[PDB]
Each structure stands twice: as C-alpha cells, then as structure tokens.
Design a protein around this nucleic acid. Sequence first.
RNA 1: UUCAACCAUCAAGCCCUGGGCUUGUGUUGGGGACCCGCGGCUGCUCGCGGGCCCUGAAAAGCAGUGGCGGGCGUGCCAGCCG
Lengths: 23, 49, 152, 154, 41, 254, 192, 267
Amino acid sequence: GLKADEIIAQRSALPAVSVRKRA
Amino acid sequence: RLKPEGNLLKDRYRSMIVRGKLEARRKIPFRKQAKTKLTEKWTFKDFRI
Amino acid sequence: SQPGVMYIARLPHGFYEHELRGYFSQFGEITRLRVVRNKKTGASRHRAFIEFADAEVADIAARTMDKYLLFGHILTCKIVPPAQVHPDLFKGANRRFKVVPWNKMAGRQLERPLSESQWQVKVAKEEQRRAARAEKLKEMGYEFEAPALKVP
Amino acid sequence: QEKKERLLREATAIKEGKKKEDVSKKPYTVKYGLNHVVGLIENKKASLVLIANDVDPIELVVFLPALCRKMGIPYAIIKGKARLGTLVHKKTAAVVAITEVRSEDKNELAKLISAVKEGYLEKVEDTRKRWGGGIMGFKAQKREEKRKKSLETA
Amino acid sequence: SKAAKGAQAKKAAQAALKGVHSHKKTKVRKSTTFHRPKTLV
Amino acid sequence: ALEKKISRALGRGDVSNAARLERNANLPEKTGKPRYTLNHIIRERYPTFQDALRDLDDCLSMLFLFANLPSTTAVPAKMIARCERLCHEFQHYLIVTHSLRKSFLSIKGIYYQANIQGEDILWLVPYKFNQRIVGDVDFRIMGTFVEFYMTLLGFVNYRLYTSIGLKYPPKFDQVKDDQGAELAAFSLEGLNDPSQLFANFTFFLSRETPRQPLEFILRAFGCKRIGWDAVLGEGAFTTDESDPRITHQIIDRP
Amino acid sequence: FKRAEKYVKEYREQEREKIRLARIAKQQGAKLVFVIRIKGINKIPPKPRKILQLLRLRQINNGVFVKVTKATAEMIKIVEPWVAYGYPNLKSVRELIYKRGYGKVNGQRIPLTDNAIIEENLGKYGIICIEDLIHEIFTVGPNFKQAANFLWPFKLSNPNGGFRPRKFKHFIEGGDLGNREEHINALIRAMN
Amino acid sequence: IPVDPDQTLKACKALLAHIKKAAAADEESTVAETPIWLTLTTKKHIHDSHRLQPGKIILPHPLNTSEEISVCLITADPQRFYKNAVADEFPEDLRAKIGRVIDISHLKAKFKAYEAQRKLFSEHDVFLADTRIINRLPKALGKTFYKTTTKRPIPVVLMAQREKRDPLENANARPIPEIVAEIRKAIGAALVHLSPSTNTAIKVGYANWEPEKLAANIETVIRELVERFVPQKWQNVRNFYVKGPETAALPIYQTDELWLDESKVVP
RNA sequence: UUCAACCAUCAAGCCCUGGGCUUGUGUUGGGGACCCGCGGCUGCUCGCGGGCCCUGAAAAGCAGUGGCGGGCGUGCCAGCCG
C-alpha cells in the first residue's frame, strides 16, 4: 500500500454506527 | 499630393447640432467621485499574533 | 537586542536564498541567512537557518509560517534557543553557494598530458596493482599472463 | 447539462443493448447535505469534513466537531456557507465532505489532511475548550483603565 | 523603535494569514437622517 | 438583468453558464449589428420609402465616414465591417442600375450624386487616409447615429434589390475579401447615353490611383474590364501592366 | 505584501526560461510576419527584453511588421512567450496602415493623413504614397527595413473593454505557443 | 578483436564455480537470479554528459527470458489503443510478460509522487518506452528511475515512419507485428548506459546459464560496444573485467599503452 | 495582490529503398551494509562512476574549490567558465 492511502483511511478505534442494514 | 482639409466627424456633428437633432455639449473628462471614508475591517482589527 | 535564529525545513524546490531573504524582509530585516546545500552537487538539502536581529520578530515569523502548506510541503519553522545556537552555524552565510563540476575537472586531469617521470610512476603503480590483484586471484583458481607495460 | 448528456449516452447504450455501467464510469464528487454528511461520518466513510462557520441556527452543526473527534475524522471549520455553495452549485452549503478521490489526487488529499491535522487541529486543541466572548466596550474599557490607574495612584 | 518593528512584523503576519484587503470604504453622511432609497417602479 | 446574471455566474465560477447567458446578450463585438433591434423604429420614423430616400443623404455620409475608422468600444470592428458591407451593396446597386449621375473632387472629399426613383441623393466620402477623431465631438452619440443609419440602410438595400429583382443579401466571398477584393468580393445573382461611356475601353489603374472611387465610377459608367496592381487587391480583370488589351491607364506619378 | 508561492513561482518560471534560452542558443540552427506584444511572465530575462527593445514591443498590444530572416527567426523564437505572431494578409496590412498607421517624423507620432509625409520621409527610396508603402511592406522589397522603421508600432485595442463583466480580462491569453500562421488575421480583425 | 575467447570461457567457469561454492556456504534460488557484469575501463570519460536513453545491443542469447519477468510498456497517447493491441493481437508469451501499459499523460497524472514512482519501480523488472516520449520521462520519473541504471526505460520504436495529433482520432502507430518484433528485440537486447565515467557495467547474463553462452554473449557485446559506443575505438579502451554482484573482478583484457595518443607524451 | 498548463505525443541528417543508424541533455534529499573500476594521497583515506536495499515531496552546524567580467582586496553577483 501507500502512506497516502494509510493517512486517508486512518480512523479511530470506535466502531461504525449505522441506522439500518443496507444493500 | 492633395492635402485634405477639415474633419468630417466634426462636420457631421456640427450638421446635427445646427439642424437641431441634439444640443451642443462639452466633454466631461472627470466626474466627481462619491465622498467616502476608509476604515479597517473588524477581523483585521481583532487579529492577534 | 539579542538576535534570533530560526530553522526552516521542508523547503520546496525554488524557495532558496533570494526568495527567503525577500519574503522575510517583509517581516523584518535579516542579519544572516544560509541554505544548507550539498557540496557534492550544489543542490539544496531542503533546510535553512535565518538570523534576524530581533528574536521577537523571529518568533512572529516562526509562528506565522509554521505548518504552512507551500507547493505540497508543510513548512517547519522553529526558533532555536540561544544556548543551542551553534557558534559555527552561519559560516558561509550571505554569499552564494556555487556549483562546481568535479566530474568535469576529473575528466580534464584524465585528459591532461603529463611528464614522463610520473608516466613511469603510474605504470609502476599499475604494476604492483596488477601484482596485488594477482595474489588476490590466486585463490580464484584463475591465471592470466600479464603483458608488461613498456615505458615511454 | 452534464447529467443530461450522460443520460442521453446511457439511453443510447441501452438502445444498443449495453448496460449503463459500460458507458459510464464511477463518479467521484464532494459530498454535501447535512444528513448525508452526518451519515457518512457515522459510517466512517468521509475522509475529510469541512464545516461552515456561520450556520444559523448553530444547533445544526454544534455537535459536528465532537462527532468528528469521536469518529476519528479530520474536520476543519471554514469561512463561508456561500463559499461551499459555490462548490456544490447551490447558494449555501452547511457542510461538505470527501469520502474518496481519484488516484492522481490521493497524494493531494493526504497532504491536505496532514496539513489540516498539524495546522488547524493542533492549534485549536486547547482553544476549543475556552469560553468565548466577555469583551467589554470601548468606553467601558476606558473607564476601567482610568479607575485602575486612579486606584494605583492613590 | 521596537514598537515600530513589532508593528511591521505584525502587519506582515496579518497579511500572510489573512490577505491584503484589510480596508473597506464607508460612505460619509452629512445628515443624521436615513431615507428610503429610490428604486425602479 | 442579464448582465447581472452573467456577473453572478462569473463570480460563482460557472463559466459554461456565463457563456450560455452571454450568447443571449447579442453583443455588437460578436454580431456586428446594433445591440438593440430598431426595425420597429425605422417604420415609425419613415412612413414612406421616399422619406427613407430623402434621409439617405445623411445616412450614406455617416456610414461612408465610419467605414474608414479604427475600432472603439462604441463602434466595434464587426460593426464597421458591416457598415462597409452595406456601403458596397449600395454601390453595387448603383453600378447595376446606372443611377450615379455626378461626382466632385473637393478639398474635403468626393461628392457623389445619384438618382434613385426620382430623388437626388448627394453624399460625401472621405479620401482613404487616417481620419482623425477629435475630442470636440460626442463619439458615442455618433455611434448611436451609426446604429440607426445601419438599420435604415439594410432595409433600403433590401427594398432596392428586390425592386430590381436581385437576391438580397448578395453572395460574399470571405477569401476574396481577405485577399482584398473590396467591391469585387460580391457576386450578384438574379432572384429565383452615359451608361456606356467606358463600355468599349479597358482600364488599368496604377498603384498610386484611388482604386475604390475610380473602380466605382468606371464600373457604374460602363466599364466592364478594369485591372490594377496586385497590391490594390484581388478581383482585377488583369494584373500585368504589359497586357496589350489595355486601352487606358490611370497614373499620377511624375 | 508578496506571497511565498509567488516567490517560488517566479523562481521556477525564470529557471524554465533560462533552460529554454540556453537550449535555443546551444541548438542554434523571406516572408512577412505580424508580431503583437502580449502579456507573459512578469520578469523578463535581459536578452529577451533587449530583443523586445529592438523590436519596439515594450507596451502590450503593440504590433510590428517583421521580415523573416535567420536572425529575425532566432529572435522571434527567443521572444515567443511574450509575443503572438503570424502571417498577415493584404486586407490586414491595408486596414492597419490606413486606419492605425502613424509615421515617425523626428521622433514624434504623426498620423498618415496625406501622401506628403510619405513623400518627404521616403521619397528618396521611391515610396511616394501610402499604397507604395503598403506595396513595400506586403511584397517585402529592398526598403522594408526603412519602411518598418518609418511606421510607428500599431496600438491595438482590447475588445473585452466593451463588456463590463469581463472588462479587466486581456484579449490574448497565454498558452498557444508558436506560430499562428494565417490565424493571426482573426486577432487583427478583432483588435484593429 | 584483441581479446581471446579461451580466457573468457575459462573466466566464466571460474566465476560460476565461485558462485556455487559461495552459495553452498534455497541453494538453487541463491545460485539463480545472479547477474553477470561486464566492466569496461577506459582512459577518459566515455561520453561528455549523462545520457538517460540507454543503447541497445542485440544478443544471440536473449536476456530476461524467464516467465516471472514483468514488462511495463509506456506509449504515446492514448493507452487504450495499445492496451487493446496487447489484449487482442499479441502472442501469449508477450501478453503474459507485459503486466502494465500506461501512456505518458496517465504516468504524469498518477505517478508524480516519489512514493508512487518507487512503487512503479518495485512492481516491474523491465520498462520499455516509446521514442516519441522518452525525452519527457526523466522529469516524469525523477531520480527514482535514473539514479540507478538498472531499470531505465529502454527505447522502442512504435511510431509509424513517414498540427496537433488527436490521440482519439489517430494513433500514428506502426503495424502490430512490427511492434511485437520491436518489443521482443528490446526485451532480449542488452543495455548500455553512457555517463561521464571511465567505467561502464553491463549485465550480460546469469550464473545459471552456461559458460559457452556467457562467452559468446560477452564477445559480441564487447565487439559491438567498442565499435559503436566507445569513442576513439580500442586505444581508448583500457581494461575489461567480469564480475558478479559480490564476487571479485576477473580481468579478461589489459592494454599495453595507457595513453589515448602520443600527444599526451610531453618531455 | 491566480501555487494551472506549456520539452520532440516527433523533427533534422545518413544508407539509398532497407526500414534500420546518429543528433535533438531532460534526474528531490538523505540513510545502511557491501563487491568493484579509475585518479590523487608515502600510505591510510579522499574524490569520480558503477552494484544491493530503505523512505509521506521524509530533513536540526560541520561550506568545499580556481578564474573571467560586474559591484563596493572583498562570507557580493537573481552573470558565466573550470
């Protein structure tokens, strides 16, 4: 991979929040 | 070697004025500007560093 | 009063001595300035040291231009403490750093005609160079009959 | 006009017996609309968030820095909802976001994200916790300075 | 003066961080009466 | 309102929207016509074609004067080229109908008197030189006069060409115009005695001679074969001065 | 105040221009052209600005007639980033000389309102009228240099000045580098 | 040629035996992928400046014939025509060998980053470049590709041999079998690089080949390199060596005169 | 008070009919082992050029050599050569 891709995809450790299951 | 005399623009302009399709006016090279006061913007006043 | 020295890195290509002097002269008059350049080729090493006569003006310049995004570079501007200022930091400052063709020089001495005395010197040192390579290639299992250098 | 041209091309492809995916490529655009951007932040899809500084009512965006901080999204407060509307072909946009870009702009996006991180968030890390306002007027400040000077003299 | 060089550096910082359009023209008013501007009818 | 919309589009960066709104502005710099259409004004001001022919003196003097001027913001270059086009069309009508009667080389210009449908029309044309624009005239209101007289002369030319049964506007060759044909760039096609003084002669105009008045007068008074130097322009009957078919040559050199 | 990005941009532009000029000078290697001075980069290197001084193209929208030789071709190749040049035709030459033609008499700008000025200043060379001047310029005769030196540089107009939302925009945009050939005639029509 | 072939073949056997006995201290994988370098030493600089377009020397035993070698081809605009040509009208071995086709515009767009250039450098072994655009590749690829001469873009000819050309309307390309012949010739040819130096190193083969093949290869590259790419021919030539990446240099030719000409002799 | 794009997306010259050859000069900076070639250095070593890896367009003195012209002998040249 690339360091640019790592920086763009870097997030926090808390999991995602979803309103509903999507397709 | 003919030397043309007169100006045909001025001739047509004088013809218009004499026949009365418009009145004789002079050129205004400068117009009076609106009197204003210059002040600094609030963000530039409150900038701090 | 006390002069102030700022260290600026992450320099983009083109933001060099004259541009630094002209840009930071707007902030304040600059005592000394030096861009760290390689003596090998003359290219910049993307860092420089600027000494203003005023540490407070230097501090303003550092806080203004720190983390500035310029030509894909996030500039690093810091104030070095006077105790950490090296005494030989600005040697060669305020004068241009010239580019020198070392390779062109070396080609010129390779093409320079020399005198016969150092011609026997050079063929002699070639003789023990080839000899030394010969006991190096004894362990090789290799052998070459070396033609002797005829002296001019 | 661009959407109309794309729809005409897709209709031509459908008439010739090809899917619209064969003639149209995957788009990459900025994301706008407050509900959409909040959903993208909650789903951790948005790479960068820009919030207008002058949204009235302020309750629409007052939680957005905290939400971005909790989700680990780079955010920045920028001047001009009209300036964001000029991006999104509207009069006004409250918030915009980037989820992903093209390959030739991935480096530019990462450099912008890093520049935001060390140039906005590190500088406002402390000042975001302070109470604003409290500035006294010109005449009141002059009266207070005169009173303090008189108290110091006497 | 030290205040003068500090003001010059602060002006340079202000120009670097905010730009050069620091001033706005303001109309002078010889009267304290505001009138509704005449518009196209 | 449209200019405000264009300024809004330019300020928001919608360049395509700005161009699409600008093509509705109908600018003189891009069309060569007046910004505002005066067709309803022309009929109101001239109830009769006789009144149009009677104001044609001032109309022709105005347009023949502005055919030789540099470009300004009031009168752009496309507008000046349109004025030249209308003057050339009127000249071709006069040449075909043999309506030109008198001409006069005065110290200020060339007077032409023609007779169209019983009305004598006398107008003045400057010599082809650099005309001086002075500050003693109101050039912008002169430009408004140019717009009005251009709109009038277009309809006058259409009525005259339809009356003599010719296709209006005449075919115009841009390549020959760029090569410098002037009057020779027009090809007049049918729709759907001092007229023959110079009929039997072959004329050659030298380089110093005034090509436009000489060609106009000779071709209106019967000459069918006029040649000239190649720098005077395209459309000559012949170019070589040593052509033995030439009977008369105009020169003015010592 | 001047921006650091402006400083870096100026350095990179001058570096590119230095590379281009050195490449042209190392590589080294008769018609009529019309040359119009346009807007380029702000700082001009000394050799291109000296060539512009010789060609009398200091002001933007100045137009001159140039006879194409080896030397003049080299100088045109040098000053391409600040000029737009092409092949003028007979109508363009005639309209430029008749409508915007001025003469250099004792260092002052005298309009060509008659044949007497041309006969006084160029009559020893056989050019006694404006159409003789046009013939010499168009056919590129023996006296082309003196005819072009007699003609003052043409001051062309800016059509954008006739429209308020785009009044400040320059008419000729930079980027279309190189000869324009016969396409300079559209520029002459729009700016004459 | 002043060089003798029996010495060269003996030197290849000795160097190969050294390579196996050094690797013995996977064994076969260590023996293989080991390049063989021919070293030319001259008396002066072989060329006045750095030339970033390598020269090609045709070899009876081609290099890079292994199927694991990936080839990146750079063409003029557009890349779509050449991608379709590779996908349709190319032989299967070349189709498997060519792993990426990218034109100059997409290269300048997607690979302006130094990390992107290093990734493209690491993702391929042989880079081929159309001669119409090979002058713009030093700026588009940087010092990542041109600090080391191993993976410099090899010049290939894809232009059809006799205004602004529209890439979508026309490609101006030579026929596909000619393109295939040019690509296979450039892949099989050995590469020479000119720098202001007295030393030039050229990869002639691998350790896993046979010394007869190395001897024939080194003989033909010596003769072609001297007759074409060495100014002043053999009296400029000083020494020839054969070496591995970590082995010593085995001489195969020394000279008797160390001077280009007698004018250097000054009394 | 604009951080855009802009080299040759092929030309010219050879062979003289084969589709081949020559020129058109254009590279971010550092770090680590380690095989070499060539010039100085008594020698170590230092230069010039290659070989194998690492890296966000990364960075914390160590600047080293001779001259033409220009500026006021010179820690000055947004001018060159070595």
